[model samples]
Structure formats: C-alpha cells, structure tokens
Target: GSSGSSGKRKPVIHGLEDQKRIYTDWANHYLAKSGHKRLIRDLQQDVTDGVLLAQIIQVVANEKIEDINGCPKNRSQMIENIDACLNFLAAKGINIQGLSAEEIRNGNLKAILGLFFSLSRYKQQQQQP
Candidate 1:
C-alpha cells in the first residue's frame, strides 16, 4: 500500500501491476548499470536479517535519521548487521553519501546505547502474563 503524506487511496490494480513492472525494469537497469555485486549482496543480507525494508524506505522518505537512539536494544545487533551491510556496499563502490561519517560515528558511539531503554520496556511487556 502507498503511504506517506499522501492520504490512503486504493490504487488501481491494473495500474499497480504496471507500476511494479516499471519498477522492476528500472531496478534491473540500475543493477546492470551500476554492476555493484557487493552492494547487492549487502542488500540481500539486510533482507535476510529482517531489518524491514519498509523502515529503510520510511527513513529515506523522511530524508533524515531522526532520534537514532530511540530504537530498541535489539537494534544494536541490527545496526551491527547494517554496518556489515554498509561495509559490503562500500567495498562494492556503492557510496552511502546520504549518511556521513560524522553521523555514523555519532550513531555508533552515542545513539544506540539508549536503545536498551526501549528494549527493556518491550521486555517488561513480554514478561507480563
């Protein structure tokens, strides 16, 4: 379903299928042109690790990483996984220009520790019968 500031509206099913095809074609063209195997592999890993493509998409749409520390502790592991993904992408010459080095340093050093608080709350909830 399409989301964002755009209000919810039912997409024409036929048009949606066509849109998907167009997107697929565009993606294929991008992959072929970029020829970045490591980036593709990293993206594959992000999917395998359950990072939620929707979350990434939302972040991109928002155009800012808001409250880096506002995630769950499990997010630390997730971030590590994401870092590995990023490293792989870097190795393949896929520049993650959107996220700067300073941002990464700040996120890693200060942001993720706070996630434990959020995770603790989730744990408390789960502990309840």
Candidate 2:
C-alpha cells in the first residue's frame, strides 16, 4: 500500500534584483556596441529617478526637440534613453500600441495608465486560485 499525500508547494517569489542586473548588463553592452554611452547614462539616470513609463512615452511622442537641450547638453542621449525605456517596457509584456510618434504625443496619458492598471488587475484575477 502506498501513502496518498501531496508534496508541499513552495512559493516562488520573482526577484526584480536579478532582472535589474541583467537589464543593466544588456544596456551596457548596447552602449558599448553602439557608441552611445551618453545616451545610456542619461537613460540610467531616468530609470533611477523612477520616471513613469507613460510620461517617457508622452515626451518622446510630443516634444518638438528630439533631445534635451538644457544645461545637461545631452539631448540626443535623452531621446535614446526614452527609446530604451520604451523598448524595455515593451519587452515586459506591456502592449504599447505601435503608434506613430505624433500619435503618442497626442494620446491621453491618464487614459493609457488607467487601461494599463485595469489590465494588470485582470491579470491578477486570472492568476488567482
């Protein structure tokens, strides 16, 4: 006779630290390969400052100047940073409707964020037991 007992289920906590490290490594590699260190650094600062994804998209879509021409003098770099941020977010299963840059500028940020939050909630419910 065999015992009928199920094995204990272990909780799987997804760690962001590892993912962050990997992202950093990839960004560094990209910078090195593309000769875009300035861009990479600007983007890194933005990420560190916790800039919202929607805001970045809005700027890239709406801003007349492609680069930030303030005291930093790294406008092109900032544009690249925005691109990198958008790319990274897209890779994370975030569906950014492939809108033209102009369309993005015209989009409603509040509505977009609200839709994202709603989808996130729906995903949570689907994963529930």
TM-score per candidate, in order?
0.26, 0.28
Residue-level lDDT tens digits of model 1 in 3-106 = 12556678566343243333333233333444434222222222333233223322222233332323335635445544543443444344443442233334
Name the TM-score of candidate 1: 0.26
Of the candidates shown, which would achieve the greatest lDDT relative to the real structure? 2
List per-prediction Cα lDDT, in the order shown.
0.33, 0.36
Residue 119 of model 1, lDDT score: 21
Q: Worst ten-residue run, lDDT, model 1?
A: 110-119
Show pairs that collide, candidate 1: none
Candidate of highest TM-score: 2
Each prediction's RMSD to truth:
17.4, 14.5
Error of 1 at 107 (Å): 15
How would you encode candidate 2's per-residue C-alpha lDDT over 1-129 as one tens digit per residue?
A: 112257886967534433333333433443344444443332223242223333333332332323322222343433443344445445555564552222222333333333333324323434435
